[PDB]
Write a protein that binds this DNA or RNA. Structure first.
Ligand code: ADP
Ligand code: BEF
Ligand code: MN
Length: 437
DNA sequence: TTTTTT
């Protein structure tokens, strides 16, 4: 099944169910043939996990690259997160024969930028093959999994869960993964469970992967941070079936609005989340709501997210980001989106001389669109004006509060606006212009 | 994801 290594560069797809071996068996096979393989995965947890597993199951200690830990062994297989790959500077000259863009169903901006980088540098780097692997391609619909029995939750149970309940005997003893749409819910549920005498831990972006025990009874409560790649050896997965997403609204008031909303999971999410169990053995998947929305396309806001990440984390200029996103959108078989590259590139191109201290603060705070948030703050500081509001999002300006006055020079909307507003700032006029033509 | 001196 795995694509054969051609004589000249070629991009191929690899589609197989969750747990089939795409991220482990396949690269092992390629390595056995004498090829140097690089596997890019969006999950730090899974990446670190591949190192241990491959070591004691495939008799191979691969190189590991993540922002948390690096392991260089010199093996013919390297596992790296897209993030670390971008941070390292992309493809290295003549380093690998095959590059596997693993879990290519992921629509987070880091994965998009990472895959686009590969599609644009691979051939020049000397790679002869690029593989786009996923158990859930664009137009895919959730299909029955041989190892996973799906059981709906009911109103019976001593643990409230998104309108339904979870019976304690369903998670008492054994290993279980519970998906919650938000970090706050994860903390609350874990606490609720711990209080009942169960071994429960929360996990989401920001916490150490070590919080999840390798063995022994445990109930992990997580966000989509454990949706893909990861094998936690769970006997079951309980899914709230909801997720948090973002949408861009060109509301011209004065420019655009990026609204975050909680909605039902799409087909990719349902299959990937379900697939965290039933990996190399039988498992159970319990759900709150059946069905799901179609997959295959993402919002223009994700493109905005890519430019933002490029500027804030990967030292990529807007033009550089465009080159990479074009490669991604010009390759068939991947998630599609409106072609708003010109628009978004022009938007970020005008955002110069951001206050580094603010950028640093929004990145560490883990805010969405840290560059846009920090840039709005930068403009407020320079105009000696207050932020749109005084919610956590704008705390980086508290130190200047006593000096801030007048209306806020609104560049765009990222949340609720309480203070008066002015739309005459050069940047606001520029963005409005970008939206015109 | 990516990410801390003297
Ligand atoms: N970290 C791990 N710990 C234990 N088993 C693992 C681990 N990773 C993979 N496996 C085993 O190998 C199989 C294939 O895993 P993997 O390659 O990640 O699947 P996928 O096809 O979803 O990419 C799993 O079903 C499981 O039995
Ligand atoms: F499809 Be597997 F869960 F990476
Ligand atoms: Mn995988």
């Amino acid at each position: 099944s795995p694509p054969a290594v051609p004589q000249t560069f070629q991009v191929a797809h690899l589609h197989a169910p969750t747990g089939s071996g795409k991220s482990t068996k396949v690269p092992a096979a390629y390595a056995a043939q004498g090829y140097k393989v690089l596997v890019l995965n969006p999950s730090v947890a899974a990446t670190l996990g591949f190192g241990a597993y491959m070591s004691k199951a495939h008799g191979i200690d691969p190189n590991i690259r993540t922002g948390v830990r690096t392991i260089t062994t010199g093996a013919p297989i390297t596992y790296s997160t897209y993030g670390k790959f971008l941070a390292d500077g992309g493809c290295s000259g003549g380093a690998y024969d095959i590059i596997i863009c693993d879990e290519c169903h992921s629509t987070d901006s880091t994965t998009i930028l990472g895959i686009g980088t590969v599609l644009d540098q691979a051939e020049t780097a000397g790679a002869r093959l690029v593989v786009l692997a996923t158990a859930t391609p664009p137009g895919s619909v959730t299909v029955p999994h041989p190892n996973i029995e799906e059981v709906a939750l009911s109103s019976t149970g001593e643990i409230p869960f998104y309108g339904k309940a979870i019976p304690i005997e369903t998670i008492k003893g054994g290993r279980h993964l519970i998906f919650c749409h938000s970090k706050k819910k994860c903390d609350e549920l874990a606490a609720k469970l711990s209080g009942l005498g169960l071994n429960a831990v929360a996990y989401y972006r920001g916490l150490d992967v070590s919080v999840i025990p390798t063995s022994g009874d445990v109930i992990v409560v997580a966000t989509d941070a454990l949706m893909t790649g990861f094998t936690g050896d769970f006997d079951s997965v309980i899914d709230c079936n909801t997720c948090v997403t973002q949408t861009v609204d060109f509301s011209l008031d004065p420019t655009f609005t990026i609204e975050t909303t909680t909605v039902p999971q799409d087909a990719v999410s349902r299959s990937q989340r379900r697939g965290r169990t039933g990996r190399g053995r039988m498992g159970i998947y319990r759900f709150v709501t059946p069905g799901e929305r179609p997959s295959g396309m993402f919002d223009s806001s994700v493109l905005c997210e890519c430019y933002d990440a490029g500027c804030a984390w990967y030292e990529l200029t807007p033009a550089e980001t465009s080159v990479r996103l074009r490669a991604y959108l010009n390759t068939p078989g991947l998630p599609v989106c409106q072609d708003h590259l010109e628009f978004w590139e022009s938007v970020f191109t005008g955002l110069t001389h951001i206050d580094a201290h603010f950028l640093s603060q929004t990145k560490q705070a883990g805010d969405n669109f840290p560059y846009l948030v920090a840039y709005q703050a930068t403009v407020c500081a320079r105009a000696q004006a207050p932020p749109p509001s005084w919610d956590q999002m704008w705390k980086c300006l508290i130190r200047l509060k006593p000096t801030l006055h007048g209306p806020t020079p609104l560049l765009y909307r990222l949340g609720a606006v309480q203070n008066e507003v002015t739309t005459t700032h050069p940047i606001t006029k520029y963005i409005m212009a970008c939206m015109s033509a």
